[PDB]
Structure formats: C-alpha cells, structure tokens
Amino acid sequence: PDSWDKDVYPEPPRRTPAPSPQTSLPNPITYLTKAFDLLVDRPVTLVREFIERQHAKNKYYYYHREFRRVPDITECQEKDVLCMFEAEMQWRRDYKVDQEIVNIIQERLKACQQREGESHRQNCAKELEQFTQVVKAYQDRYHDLGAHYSARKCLAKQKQRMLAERKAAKEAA
Amino acid sequence: YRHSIFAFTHVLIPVWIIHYYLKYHVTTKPYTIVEKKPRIFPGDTILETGEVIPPMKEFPDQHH
Amino acid sequence: HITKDMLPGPYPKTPEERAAAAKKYNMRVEDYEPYPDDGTGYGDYPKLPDRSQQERDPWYDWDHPDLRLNWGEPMHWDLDMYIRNRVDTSPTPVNWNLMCKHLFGFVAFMLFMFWVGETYPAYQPVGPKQYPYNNLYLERGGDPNKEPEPVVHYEI
Amino acid sequence: MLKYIIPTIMLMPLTWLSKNNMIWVNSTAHSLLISFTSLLLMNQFGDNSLNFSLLFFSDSLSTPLLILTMWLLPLMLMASQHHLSKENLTRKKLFITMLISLQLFLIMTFTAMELILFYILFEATLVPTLIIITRWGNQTERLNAGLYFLFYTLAGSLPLLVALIYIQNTVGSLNFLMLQYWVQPVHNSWSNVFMWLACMMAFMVKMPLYGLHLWLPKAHVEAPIAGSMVLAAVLLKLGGYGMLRITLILNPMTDFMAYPFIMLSLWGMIMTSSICLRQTDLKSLIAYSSVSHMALVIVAILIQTPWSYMGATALMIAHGLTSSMLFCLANSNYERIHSRTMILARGLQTLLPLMATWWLLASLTNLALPPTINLIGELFVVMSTFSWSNITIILMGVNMVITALYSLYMLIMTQRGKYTYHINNISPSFTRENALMSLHILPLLLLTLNPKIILGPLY
Amino acid sequence: YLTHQQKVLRLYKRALRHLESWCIHRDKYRYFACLLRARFDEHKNEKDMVKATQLLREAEEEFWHGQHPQPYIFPESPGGTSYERYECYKVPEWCLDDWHPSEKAMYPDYFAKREQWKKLRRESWEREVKQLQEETPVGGPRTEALPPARKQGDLPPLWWHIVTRPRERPM
Amino acid sequence: MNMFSSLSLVTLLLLTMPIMMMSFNTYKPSNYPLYVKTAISYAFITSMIPTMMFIHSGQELIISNWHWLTIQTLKLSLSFKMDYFSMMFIPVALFVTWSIMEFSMWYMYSDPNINKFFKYLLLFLITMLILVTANNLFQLFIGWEGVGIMSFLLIGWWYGRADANTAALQAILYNRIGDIGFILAMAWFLTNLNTWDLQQIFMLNPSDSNMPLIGLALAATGKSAQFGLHPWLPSAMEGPTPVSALLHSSTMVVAGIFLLIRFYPLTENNKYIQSITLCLGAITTLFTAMCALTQNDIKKIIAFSTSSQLGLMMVTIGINQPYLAFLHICTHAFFKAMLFMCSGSIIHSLNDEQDIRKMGGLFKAMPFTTTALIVGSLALTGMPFLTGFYSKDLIIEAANTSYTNAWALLMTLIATSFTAIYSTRIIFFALLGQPRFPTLVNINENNPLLINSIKRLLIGSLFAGYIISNNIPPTTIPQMTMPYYLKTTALIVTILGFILALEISNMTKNLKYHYPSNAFKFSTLLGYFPTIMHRLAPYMNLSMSQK
Amino acid sequence: SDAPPLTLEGIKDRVLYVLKLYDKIDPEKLSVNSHFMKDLGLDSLDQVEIIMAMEDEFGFEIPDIDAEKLMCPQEIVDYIADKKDVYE
Amino acid sequence: SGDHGKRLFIIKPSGFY
Amino acid sequence: SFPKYEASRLSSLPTTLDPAEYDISSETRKAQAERLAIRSRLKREYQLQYYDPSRRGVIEDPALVRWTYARSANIYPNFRPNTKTSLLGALFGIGPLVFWYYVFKTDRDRKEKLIQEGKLDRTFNISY
Amino acid sequence: EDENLYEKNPDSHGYDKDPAVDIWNMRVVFFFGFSIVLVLGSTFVAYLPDYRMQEWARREAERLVKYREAHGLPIMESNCFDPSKIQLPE
Amino acid sequence: GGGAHIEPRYRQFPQLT
C-alpha cells in the first residue's frame, strides 16, 4: 500500500488557528516541542533519509492480481459442477471483498465521530446516509446464510425477497 | 549513568521507534490516528486558510 | 492391595452382619451404622454425622493436621464437601432461624422504601428548563428537510 | 499428503532397526523433524481450500489439527519412557509401534475427501486406542466397560455406516467437495429423522455429548499417560470435525432436531462444570474439563451461523492443548505418589518450585484468561449463542463463573498447604518434565500472536 | 468431656478475653474482671455435683449472650491474622538426601552432624520399639501416652519426627 | 502532535522491558526492589508531559499502531483513545503507587518473594494502564480481567494462609459475576450494532439502550464491590497493605466506576438508568460505612471507608456528572492510598497487629504517623480546603440540587456524616489514650523510605485538590446557587458526627457497662451478608452437585 | 522485624519479673523451682492470671492444656523456650 | 544478619537440576 | 434472658451445650474409651511405619482407600423397579431440560415473528 | 518398584539411565524442538504471504471504493447477483 | 546494617531519635 486517495477515504480540511497566548509568561510547549524536533524528529529522520536510498537502490515491484469475470449461478445447468465451480469461488471473492468495503464505509463514519468534536452528532450526517444505504444493501446480499453459506442459498435469498416485493408491488398495484 | 544508559535504551530508543511506526506505517493508512479538532474562539486567525474568526457581539457592559 | 471384604459392601440386613461390618471400618458397632437400606445403595459405609471438618479442634495433633484427620479414620461420604474451605457449620452467636428472619426484614423494608421514594421522588421548587433554537433540534442531527416546530422561550 | 504419510511410516522400521538403547533418541528427533514440515500445509487461500488428489484434501478447518496432531506424538513418547523403561525391549517396541500407527490413522482421518474413507479410517482408530489402554493399562480389574463400546457401535458407528451408504446411492457420491454443489434440502419426514440421528449420534458419543459421557472418566483411570493425552487432544475432536463436516447436508431439518441436543449441551455445562468440584479424582476432573468445554462447540455447530464456526475452530484447538498438558501435569504426580488422588498431596510449590508455575500458567487458559485463544473462542461462542437467543447468556454467565472454581480448586488443593509429612520422596522436577511441559504452553500462547490460522475457513 | 473441673477453668480462661474485648480499657476491664472474679469465687466451694451442673449450664447461655462479635485474637492462633502465614517457609528435613553434591558440599559441618541424627535414628531404632512392646497394653494401647526412655542415655521411643521438626521462624 | 502521540505510549512501553529482565538476563541480583520502583518514578514524569499539553491544548489523540485481527464486517485493532480520563488519571496511579513501591521495600523486607512481589506489583499496573487507555471493549476487557488474576495472586500472596486462598477466590467469584454484564454489552453491541470500539457507539448514539447499561451497572457492581457484591472487598485485606492500598483502596475497585465514566453518554440519557445507579450507590454507601463504625481491626474500617466513598463515586454517575466522579476517585486516590500506608505504620509498629484494642498513645511514640494519619483523614472527613472538599463540596451540592429520589437522596446526607464517625475512633484508640500496647514495644520507624514515602503522599492530599480543581477543563455547569443550608449540608451534618462521636469517645473511658444491641450485632457482623451468604450458597452447589 | 533475638537465660529474668509483678508473689519467695501450688501458694485462679500475664508478655497464646500443667516457673521456662525455638 | 553468625541453614529441594 | 441456641442444617449445636457432656457415666467411659482405645489401634499401625528409617514414599491408608474406592457406585447399587428414588430422582436434572425447551422454543419463535413482519429493528444486524 | 533415576545417574536428565543417551537424547529433545521446530517454526507463520487473501482483499478494497465513488456508484447495491439475468417464476 | 543503630528496651519507652 502506497497512500490513500481522497475519493476513497476523504478527509476534512485542517484549520488550526495561529496561537494567541496573551499573557507574558512564555509557552513551555515551544521549548519542549523544539526538543522533540531536535531529539526525535530529526535523528530518526536522519536515519530515515538513509534507509530510503537502500530501499530505492535495490528495487523490485510486486503487483496486484486481478480476476476476470465468468458466468454466475444464473447460467449454470443443474449439478454441472465444473461450470458451478467457477461461480462459487468467484462468488466467494465477491463476498469476501464486499465485507471489507462495509468497514471502509464505517471507517469514514467512525473517524468523523471523533475528529469533528461534539458536533459529531450533526457534522457526520452524510456519512450516516453514506453508511445506512449499503448496510441495508449488504444484509440483502449475504445475511441469513449460516455457516454453510453458498451462492445457491445466496441466490435463493434474492428469490424469496424478489417474490416478496414483486408480489407486494402487484399487491399494492 | 544508570539514568542515562536506561534513558537511551528504554526511553530515547522506543520513542524514536514509535515515531517511525506512526510516521510511516500507521498514519499512511486512512482513519488510523484521530484527534479531536482544536477549539475555535472569537478573533482567531487560521494558517492553512489565513482566515480570521469574527469576534463576539457587543456585551451590555454590566456592573463588571 | 487390600482384601476384598475390607472394602465397602452391601447393606448388613442383620446385626450379625453389622458386628462383622463395623470391624472392617474398625468402628465400634455401637456408633457404626450404614445408611438406610433402599434403592440408594450407598453400601455399608459409616453414616457419620453430616457435619463440618472444622469442628475438630485444630490444636489437636493429627496425621493430617490441616485436614485434622487421623490415619485410618472412616472418612465422610461428603468429606470432599465438608472440608475447611468447603461446607462449614461452625456455631454462630445468633440463631440461624432468627438471623434469616432478621436479614429478610432488613432488605424487605429497604426495597419498600425505594418504591415509595420512586413513587414519591424529589424535585426542587422549579419548573422545566428552557433551551432556544427549538431545543437544538438541528444541532442534534435533525432533518434539514423538515422545519422543527418552533419552541420559543420568552423573557421572564 | 504423501509427503507427511510416509515419513511417519518409516518410523516403525526406525523402532525395530534402530540402536536398541537409542530408540528414544531417534524417535523424538526423527518424529520432531516431521513436526517442522507440518507447517507447509498452511499455504491456505482465501476462497478455495488446498486439495491435492482424489483422496486427500486439507483446508482451514482441518489444517490446524494436522499441525497440532503431529505435535502431540513426540510428547507422548516423552511422557512414557519413564514407565516404559520398566518394560522390556521385546515388549517395549510394541508400545511405540501402536502410537506410530495411530498417527497414520489420524492425519489421514482429517484429510479424507470421501466420507466413507473418513469413516473407515476413523473406525480403525479405536484399535490403536483400545489396545493402548487395554493391554498396557495400569488397571486390569475387569471394569466391564465392554458395554459402552458394545453400545457405541450398536447405536453409533453401525447406524452411521448404513447412514453414509444410503446417501451415496441417492446423491451419487460421498466426496465432501461434491456435496458442496449437489446437497439438497432435507424436508421434515419420519425417515430423515432416523437418518439425521445416525448421521450425528456416533460423534456425540465421542465429543462426548451429555448423557453419553459415562465412559470417558473411567478411561483415564486405566489408560496410561500416553493414551490419555491423545484421547482428549485428538480423539474427542474427531466428532467435532465430523459434525462440522457432515452438517453440510442436514439443512434445514437440523433446526428443530437441534433443540434436544442444545438443552443437554447448554444445561450440561453447569451440571458438568459443578460436578468438577465433587470429583475426588485428578484425572476425572481433568476429564470433566473436556465434557463442559466441548458442549459449547456442539451448540455453535447446531446454531450453524457463520460466526459460530469460528469459535469452535478456535475452541477445539484451544482446549486440546490445555487438557493434554494437564494430564501430564497431574500424571507427573502419579509417577511420584503412584496414584491419582488429588487430596493426598498438597503444597507442591515448596517442594517443586517451578511446577506450581505450570499449574498457574495452564489454569489461566482453562478459565479463559484474555487474550488467550481460549477466551477468543469461548467468547465467540457467547456472541453467536446470544444472537440465537438472549436467554442463553445466563447459562454462559454462570458456567464461566463456575469455570474459575475448578480452574483454581486443584491449583489451590495441590500447589499450596503443608507438605504431607509422611510423604518423603518428592524429587526435583526432571529435565524431561520441565521441557515436556514447556512444549505445550509455548505454542498455545504463541498462537495468540497469530490466531488467524485457527479461525476456520470462515475467517 | 474433660470432666467437670476442667470445663470451668476452660470457660473461665475464655470468659475474660471477651469481657476485656467489650470493656477494652485495662483499668475498666480490670474492674469488671474482679466483678467477674467475684462470681466464680462464690461458686468455688460448691460440692454437690448436680448443683455444680446447673450453675455451669447458665455460664454457657449467659456467655452466649455476652460474647463479643470481634474479640481480640493473638495473630498466631486460629482466628488470628498470623495463622498459617509462614508455614511454607518451614521445610521437610528429608529433602536433603536429594541435594546435588554442589549444594551438599557447601555445608560440611551440617551433614556430618546430620549423620549423628540418622545414625541416632537407626542405632536406637531396634531398642526403642522393644521398650514399647512390653510397655504397650495387650491387645492395643488404652491411651495415647508415649512412655519415656527407661535406661542410661536412651532415646525416647518414637522421637525422630518430633525432634527433627522445623523451626517456627526458619528465615 | 507527534511528540504528544509518542510520549503518550512511551510510558507503557517503558514498563514492559523491565519485566523481560525476569525471563532473560541475570544481570543485577539483590537490587530488584529499588530497581523496579524507578520505572514508576520516570513513568509519572514522562506521562505528565502529554498531560501538560493535554491541559493547555486539549489534545486527545487516537493511536492504533498495530492491527491484530479483522473478522468479516467487524475489525479489531490495538487502539489507544488518549482522552480526558487517562491523561489525568494515569499520573495519579503512577505517583500514588510511587510511594507504595518505595515504601514496600521496607514493609516486605523479610520476604524472599520481594522480587516476585515487585515483579507482580508492576504487572497489575500493566493491566490498569491498557485497561484505562483501552478504546474498545475487547482491548478493555483483557485488562478488565487482567486485574482479577493479579488480584487473586496478590490477595493470596501468603499461599499457606487458609483464608487467603479462599479470600482470593472469594474476590474472584464475585469478579466473575461482574463480566456477565460486560459481555452483554459486548454481545448487545455486536448483535444490535456492528462494532465494539467506543467510537462507533457514540457515533450511532442508540435511541433505545436500556439493556446494555443494565449490564454495565451489573458489571460495575462486581468491580465496584457495591451492595449485593460488596462482601468480597473486606476479605481482600488479608494480603499485604500495599496490595490492599494499591488495588482495593486506590484504583482496582474503581474500574467499575471508570467504565461508567467511559460510557457516560449512554447512561445519562435514560434517567431511569441514572435512577438505577443512585439506588445502588445510595444503599451501598449507607451500609458500607454503617458496618465500619463497629469493626475492630483498623484495616476493616479502612476498607469500608473506601466502600462508603465508592458509593459517592457511583452516586455522581447517577446525576449525570461524569468528570466530577472522575475527580472524587482521583482525589480519593490521593489520600486513601496514604491512609493504609500510614495504618501500615501501626501494623509494622505493633509487630503485625491490627486490633485497635491493643493500641493507644502513639501520638508521642509515633508522632510522624500521627502527623500523617491525621492529615489524610481530614480530606476524607470533608474538611474544607482539602482534596475531599474540592470534590465533596462541589459534588455534594449537586446531590440535593437536582431532580432526585427523596428516600435515596437522604442516604447521601447520612453517608457524609458516617464518614467521620469512625475516623475519631482510629485516632483516639490508636494514637491517643493510655498505652494499651503489649509490654514488649518495638515502636521504631527508623527506615528512610517510610519517612520519604509518607512525605510524598502528604503533598498530594493537600496541594493537589486545589491544583486539579483549578486546572481541570470545563466539562459541565458550575452549580453554585442554592440555599446555604443546602449549600454546605455536608459541613452542617459532618460536624454532627463529631458531636456524637466525641460523646462516644468520652463514653469509652467511662466505667459504664456494655449492652448487646441489635443495631450493633447486625452492624458488627456486617449485617449477616457475609456469614449467611458464605454458608447458604456453598452448600447448595456442592450438595446438589452429586444428583 | 529488625533483629530482637532471644536467649534461654534471657527468658528466665523475664519470667521472674512477671512473677515479681504478681503482688501475691513475695520477692523473697520467688525462685525458679517455686511450685505455684506449694512454694508460692498460688492456685489455679492465681496461675491463670500469671499465664495471662505471660501471654501478654510474649505475644503468643498458650492453649488451654498448656496453661494448666505450668505449676512452677521452670515448666514455663522449659515451655516458653521450646515454643519460641530459643536454643541459646 | 543482625548478629555475628546466627546464620540459619537453608533447606530446599535440589535446584541444581 | 438467654434462649437456648436454635441450630439448623447449616448451624449445629455446640458440644458444650450438649447435655451428654454434663452427665458422663461408666458406659460413657466405655464409649469414650472405645473411641480413644480404638484410636490407638490404627495409631499403632501407622506410627511404626512412618518412623521407619528405611521407608521412602507414602504409607497406604485403607480407610482413605476405602472411601476413594467407595466412589465407584454404578451398577451394584440401586435397582430398576424403584418408585421412590428412580422416579423421584428422575425429576432432578431432566425437568429443567423440558423447562428450557419451552423457554427457548417460546422465546426463539417469538423472535422469528418480528422478523417475519419487521417488528424488530435489525438495522445494524450485520453479524449473526 | 520405583527405582529412582537420580541415584543411578545423578547427572541425568530424566530420560534413561545411560549418561550418553540421556545427554544426547536431551540434546535432540531440546535442539530439534526449541532450536529448530519451535524458534524456526514460529517464523514460517509470520511471513505467510496473503494468508487467506488477507492482503489482496484490502488492496482491492481500495480501488473499488475509489471507483465506486469516482462515478457516483452506490458503494454496494442491494442486489448481490444481477436480477436482469434471473428469470423468476410467475 | 549500621551496627545496632537503636537498642531495644524492656517495659521502657523506646528510644526517640
């Protein structure tokens, strides 16, 4: 991992005001903080500036594998395992990642609670809506499967909700 | 000597070590180290933006 | 490697069985008595008073000092339960029947008072507090789309 | 997995053809090397398991047991040579040979990709187990325990054997992977009820489930130190692994069927736990530890939620390490005071300084000292169980509270107090004992560094 | 049972401490101890055994309604803080023989003197039992008394364990 | 920021390495007692450096240096939510134990397990620091249980003692029941919510949260030794006074309160929950102190004094005053730790004795202890311009000046009154009066650390309260308007104890008789709670186990 | 406990002073072999007071039986030292 | 400790092993 | 004013308050003698072995052994045709299970109802 | 019969009465276990690459979150599969 | 270990430093 792109993990702009200690008593943090700058920031940074070249001198790049897409359980004949083998393993990858991206959506909501102070009850409203929509979607995708979760049961969950809504729309029609 | 030897090995070394961990491995991940934002008071100037907060309204000048 | 008969056996249905039975356990037949004959079938082990090992005075010197047991003593059926840390029945200064009655009354009163207190709580001679901005509805994450119903507090 | 199978096999020729006085030398070193190679199986993947051939396959659910399983074998040889020394070479090698075979009969048991194959290899294990206990058991007083094994096969394996064969004809095959795509819903009908029991009853005897546990306590009275450790370390886990396995084809019928087990399982814990207090026998209470512990695993399987299976995987691994250590710890006295009586000896801290340490160190994990894996699993059970029904929390609440009682009762009843006066043979802890015990806590604690491996395929 | 006479002495011995517990102050307690002393002196001359039976019965129920809930206790006795507080520091005398020679050689004075305990334990072994055989009641001892040695320079029968016991404060 | 972050966690990592010296290395024998102490010395100084920044800048960073596990949709990590509570609290525990560590060298001089004790003493500190700084239940829980293990071992330090073995278990047994509420929160949050870290709960702000708080109240009960789960705290005094002082009188039993402060946002909203908390705090404080007036051994009175004080700590939570409850605990930590150390002077002076019926006249024999025992009690009594006043006065004003329950509220006025009733007994019986100590008197405090340790704590009991009360940030409203009799009802009613207590003290010398009082035996035996519970339940489980 | 060791000889003078603090015990009739019942004329009631005084003089409680058999100071001296492990 | 000699013997299991 | 102490199952009578001690007779002096005299017989056996110079290990105690051997009560005691113990003893242990079934069966079915209609808020009901 | 081992071979370790084997058996027992199986075995797990696709799962969790916001796509649609492909009954 | 800095006493008030 290199670094976070803002569109992925957006962060607020930082506005720290200029210090205004009106008293004539000197601020200790200026002296003490300079010590950490002169004692921990630099000498470690001095080593840091050394390590970078050694990492850069002998260089090697490891890549991020990508997975093609293949027909899913909507297109597999009954008990045709070889064609089904792709779908379930492919499906397991699909679910596996989608579990994390719920965290990432929760990462923005959790962090916004803290950094933003007491107005977290008001500031992070967008993150909530950013979060509520998916979770409703997420449980619609991989909830009520049990320890032996599978695409067929994952699909069957869609079948029971669709005929619950399709009928309901006809009922409400 | 006891204070100085232990200081480098057990105070200055870990604090150096902690710096690198946060400074290049923990911060680089999103939403890793959070800090409650600084308080804002009337008539304070910003640095990233350069803007200045309005002062407060005209107090009634009570017996104070 | 002890003889078979020197091990616990069936209930002695006649005193003559007791006469030999108490000899295995070495107890005087006068005190030796097996547990009542029934489907329980504990055997013929001594039915000692169901009491606490703490009773035996510590300052008596035994072969199991802390256990306060003498070698070869016929153990208790609930001996593993009546040891010092486990079930104990040391006499108390106050009656058990009275202490249980005394304790229940103490608590039974305490709960009743709280209900009266919770049925008659306390409040200072003041009315309800007042907050502007319609109770900070928007500052609590309210809905921007819907206007909070105004709650205005006048001067007084 | 041939890479692992054969090296164990040649250890049998190792016993026979090795230097007569170096049988203990070669076995441990040669066997130990296999333990290091055991790690290679951990090349797991996120979605697909690790499948080698048409016979043998491994995955997250079975991987830790395999690595764990071999680990035990050298320890069993270690714990035994003190009392096997009394045996002669002509009859001594008979003790090692059986143990080597049981390793073959086990590793293949957890990698059988065909249920019948699983069943077959699983069935033979009793022969190494039984002959280990029977012929070379310290007690031969005719306990008449043949009833239980007679009952077990009658109600257990045999119905299970027929049960399996019935499935193969209907679905088409019994390969575990194949059922992952051909399993079919099992409606509520009278016939399936009987299939369900036979498909589950056999394991319950071996978990063991409540009501069927009468056989386990008596075993450790008879079985020597070697037999005892594997019984709870390995043999008990067989049922859990099978139950976790076969349960892929018991939906949705398992729901209503589960409740009669669950109440036994949930209630059995407190009954089993508190009975620990009245167990006057060291090995019985140590045995009772397993009885209550496994009951958690069973419920986790029956609730069959994605979270629950993680706990059992962690719990199954967690307990086996502990109890296997405990047998040797308590057995360490049996080789000094020549009995299993807990109350007879006390205050081992003064006469055995370090030994009280191990009792302290191991007891914590039994009572689920955080962040040890034990709590990680046990706690995961509470989380998963609570969702099933909030009322379940109370039984867990009391059981854990009870857990600390016996977790510290023996640690108190034996590691403290006056040294028994007439006892005068308390020798210093031996290097074999010191090292042998350390092999248990270390990996058990070190797993805390990387518990991820023992979270089953769900993780 | 302890016979009639002992019970009063054991009760009188125990009675004072509880009184002292309630009164606490030495002068105050000394005052009512004499008043308590003024009691058992009155019934000191009682002769009729049944008459003496009824009086002591009262001292039980009467004491049962005077006992202090928290009487003072010497720490090194049951009910005291220092009971079983230093047992572990006492050590068996039989663990030496397992000592590695490195530890043993550090104490040449000790072991050479120990050999005069083991030697004194074994050389006197055969004689002492024979002392008890004729000094033991036929069919089993009636009482748990232990007769002393009955010759010149003879160890008491069954002496090893009592003598060889630890010290109250070993370290 | 970076200095603040690094210095936040250097202290903990400072403490760990010394422990490693017991597995590896045989470098320095016969110096472990002094050697270990100095870590706490340096720990306090370094820890204050973030504090001073924390005070000035209010910097409450969150640090998660290492990720330890991630399960499907729930992610775990080793997070450090550096917030108000730990920044100010940790210095208290560091320095409060500083005296104990240095003092403990002489108190446990004869013990060969002194290294083990110093080794184990620090281990408890390890639990509390991570426990207090824990940003999540799982991380919190590990410490939440860690203290118990150390609690057992330190209670049963004298493993030969029969009661110590039971006593440590007795503490354990109640402690186990505490976690039951804890796990419910863990179960309730994961079940209803989807995370355990304290951040998200405050982010979601549950509308209906009755059940988990009940667990918190129950979980706090077990760790707070409250009414219902009180009987274990008295039995933990069998251990060394530093064990009692450091754990059961300074910090350990206050963890239950600590979490309630950590979860102030949720408990406050449903005033019913606030009502629940007050009922326990009200009943506990009255009962705990009520039994203390009778007990003979000083340590027993000391333990109940903390128990009664603990009631106020919970009571403050029942009125939606989190940071104030934090204050009382810290102010209470300042001096109550000293008292047991000072009482230890009596214990060591009389050759390991605690019964005050063989004590008296130590005013001239041990003036320095009389100079130290008296000082701490003044703050406990509620005396003005003392660490107790800076919270007791400020908090006690909130006790009767907010919507309360009258019957429960009355329990507050009595509690403060009974606080000082026993205090004169200790001084009168132990310090003043005629010499009741045995003939062979070994009154000789000629040890440096004892003198040095008593000095350091005496500073905190006096100067700190004004400093903290004049240096803590504003997190609530200053409630200063109220009727003067309600303003200082503590002062009005506290002195009443003096009047009746002093009358009793004079009634002590008087040669009048002793009367067995039902309000005495009940209160002297601890209201039958230990004896009846320590004899009813144990039979049931064991006797019924065979069935 | 610093170092207040004890000696067999030392306990002897302690015993006498406890026997000197007894008003009934004449100083000239106080001696090591002075049997309480005979030489000092001190009965069971009197003896218990001494033993009670002794118990407060040494900080160890004597059981019921061990206070009865002490009818002379020598038994007490033969008794205290044996209890307190005093050898020199 | 506080006196010449009076050094009490130490009894323990054989820790050499 | 001092009522006789009222004992109970958890608090028994003191020996001193037992009238048997105030009245001790000759036959009592045999019952007392039997316990004490008999206490010597097992004392004599155990004492000699414990003091034996050449004995290492433990000395077997049959009375202790008997009790340990007495905890194996499986098939020789009790008989199937029992109405006072088998039937009555059946209730203890099995009854709660049937009680639990309705407790969990009722509670858990009630849990399903709300899901069948949305009467239960499962908004963040991710894990399960 | 309990023939104590320390008597025959006071410099033993608890395995056999043969000093060489007891030492050698001691060497292998300690060596292979602690020196090889334990210390080295610990390392192997530490550097297991992408165990259970743990590393790649997060890394790919980055791009999609970028891409899903980059084009305004809902970060997770309520349909796990594609309904359009599906053809439900009735 | 300073060489008996303060002596004990018998029934007397212990020495004050």
Contacts G44 to E, Cβ<8 Å: 9
What DSSP string describes A37-50? Answer: IIIIIHHHHHHHHH
Residues 6+ apart with CB under 8 A from A64: J56, J59, J60
**F322-349 and F255-262 helices, crossing angle to 10°:** 170
Pair H2, E88: CB distance under 8 Å: no
Least CB-CB distance to K8: which of G4, G14, G17?
G4
Cβ contact F357–E83 (<8 Å): no
Cα(B9)–Cα(B17) distance, rounded to whole angstroms?
11
Number of neighbours of residue F171 by Cβ within 10 angstroms: 28
Provide the shortest C-alpha distance from residue E23 to chain D (in Å).
37
Contacts A48 to B, Cβ<8 Å: 20, 23-24
Dihedral angle computed from the Cα positions of residues D357, D361, D363 and D367, in that order, rounded to the nearest 10 degrees: 150
Q: Which two tokens stand for residue E35?
A: 């008043």
**D2-17 and D23-37 helices, crossing angle to 10°:** 170
- D with B: touching (≥3 Cβ pairs within 8 Å): no
What are the beta bridge partners of residue F355? Answer: F297
Contacts F298 to E, Cβ<8 Å: none
> Is any Cβ of chain I less than 8 angstroms from the Cβ of A135?
yes
Residue type, F374: I
Neighbouring chains of A at 3+ CB pairs under 8 Å are: B, C, D, F, I, J
Cα(D29)–Cα(J42) distance, rounded to whole angstroms?
18
Residue type, A144: D
Three-state DSSP class for I8? strand
Cβ contact I10–F535 (<8 Å): yes
Contacts E18 to F, Cβ<8 Å: none
Q: Which two tokens stand for residue F428?
A: 């009168």
> Is any Cβ of chain A less than 8 angstroms from the Cβ of D175?
no
Residues 22..51 of B with a Cβ closer than 8 Å to A: which?
23-24, 28-31, 34-41, 44-49, 51
Q: Which two tokens stand for residue F205?
A: 């702000």
Least CB-CB distance to F199: which of A99, A113, A121?
A113
Experiment type: cryo-EM
Print burial letters for E111-129: b (CB count within 10 Å at least 16), e (below 16): eeebeeeeeebeebbeebe
Best to test chain F binding among I72, I124, I125 (most F CBs inside 10 Å):
I124
Q: What is the CA radius of gyration of chain E?
A: 25
Neighbouring chains of F at 3+ CB pairs under 8 Å are: A, B, C, D, E, G, I, K
Q: How does strand D57-58 pair with strand F74-81?
A: unpaired
Q: What is the CA radius of gyration of chain J?
A: 31
- Nearest Cα residue to J66 out of D3, E73, F271, A10: A10
Contacts E84 to C, Cβ<8 Å: 66
Cα(D451)–Cα(D444) distance, rounded to whole angstroms?
10
- Nearest Cα residue to C89 out of F532, I17, I7, I12: I12
Cα(A130)–Cα(F317) distance, rounded to whole angstroms?
35
E strands, F426-517, are none
Cβ contact G60–E10 (<8 Å): no
Pair C61, C91: CB distance under 8 Å: no
- Nearest Cα residue to D338 out of I56, I57, C64: I57
What are the beta bridge partners of residue D114? Answer: D175
Residues 6+ apart with CB under 8 A from D323: D232, D233, D286, D289, D290
Q: Which two tokens stand for residue G21?
A: 């603090």
Contacts D28 to J, Cβ<8 Å: 25, 28-29, 32
Cα(D343)–Cα(D352) distance, rounded to whole angstroms?
17
Residues 134..163 of E with a Cβ closer than 8 Å to D: which?
161
Pair D267, I97: CB distance under 8 Å: yes
- Percentages helix, strand, coil for chain J (3-state, rounded to 5) are 60, 0, 40
Cβ contact K13–F365 (<8 Å): yes
Distances (CA, A) of F368 to C147, F371, F435, J44, K17: 69, 5, 17, 62, 12
φ and ψ at D335, to 5 degrees? -85, -5
Cis status of the peptide bond prior to E157, with omega within 30 of 0: no
- K with F: touching (≥3 Cβ pairs within 8 Å): yes
Residues 6+ apart with CB under 8 A from C96: I6, I7, I8, I10, I11
Residues 6+ apart with CB under 8 A from F350: F358, F359, F437, F438, F442
Chain E to chain F Cβ contacts (< 8 Å): 60
What is the sign, positive or negative, of the torsion defined by CA atoms of D7, D9, D11, D13? negative
Cis status of the peptide bond prior to D208, with omega within 30 of 0: yes
Q: Which two tokens stand for residue F192?
A: 């209803």
Cα(E128)–Cα(E155) distance, rounded to whole angstroms?
7
**Which residue is closest to C65 within chain D, CA to CA?**
D418
Residues 60..79 of C with a Cβ closer than 8 Å to D: which?
63-67
Three-state DSSP class for D417? coil
> Is any Cβ of chain F less than 8 angstroms from the Cβ of I11?
yes
Sheet holding B34-35, edge to edge: B34-35, F61-71, F74-81
Provide the shortest C-alpha distance from residue C132 to chain A (in Å).
17
Provide the shortest C-alpha distance from residue E111 to chain D (in Å).
18
The alpha carbon of A129 is separated from its chain's Cα centroid by a whole number of angstroms, namely: 15
What is the sign, positive or negative, of the torsion defined by CA atoms of B8, B14, B15, B19? positive
> Is any Cβ of chain F less than 8 angstroms from the Cβ of I89?
yes
Contacts G59 to E, Cβ<8 Å: 74, 76
Provide the shortest C-alpha distance from residue A119 to chain I (in Å).
23
The alpha carbon of F379 is separated from its chain's Cα centroid by a whole number of angstroms, namely: 15
**D306-334 and D431-446 helices, crossing angle to 10°:** 170
The alpha carbon of F119 is separated from its chain's Cα centroid by a whole number of angstroms, namely: 22
Catalytic residues of G: 43
Contacts K10 to G, Cβ<8 Å: 14
Contacts J13 to E, Cβ<8 Å: none
Burial of C51 (0-12, 13-18, 19+ CB in 10 A): middle
Cβ contact G2–H2 (<8 Å): yes
Q: How does strand B34-35 pair with strand F61-71?
A: antiparallel
Cβ contact E82–F352 (<8 Å): yes
* Total residues found in chain D within this entry: 459
Pair J83, A161: CB distance under 8 Å: no
Best to test chain F binding among B5, B12, B13, B22 (most F CBs inside 10 Å):
B22
Cβ contact J60–A64 (<8 Å): yes
Number of neighbours of residue A66 by Cβ within 10 angstroms: 8
Distances (CA, A) of E78 to C58, E83, F294: 8, 6, 22
Question: Which residue stretches of chain E are H helix?
Answer: 3-23, 26-42, 49-64, 101-105, 108-123, 125-135, 160-163
Task: Give the DSSP letter of residue D50.
Answer: E
Provide the shortest C-alpha distance from residue E40 to chain F (in Å).
19
Least CB-CB distance to E167: which of G44, G59, G85?
G85
Residues 96..155 of A with a Cβ closer than 8 Å to F: which?
99-100, 102-103, 106, 109-114, 120-121, 124, 135, 138
**Which residue is closest to A99 within chain I, CA to CA?**
I126
Best to test chain A binding among F54, F191, F193, F203 (most A CBs inside 10 Å):
F203
Cβ contact I58–D423 (<8 Å): yes
> Is any Cβ of chain H less than 8 angstroms from the Cβ of D356?
no
Cβ contact G14–K10 (<8 Å): yes
Residues 153..172 of F with a Cβ closer than 8 Å to D: which?
153, 159-160, 165, 169, 172
Cβ contact C58–E64 (<8 Å): no
- I with D: touching (≥3 Cβ pairs within 8 Å): yes
Q: Which two tokens stand for residue E106?
A: 């550090």
**Which residue is closest to F441 within chain G, CA to CA?**
G57
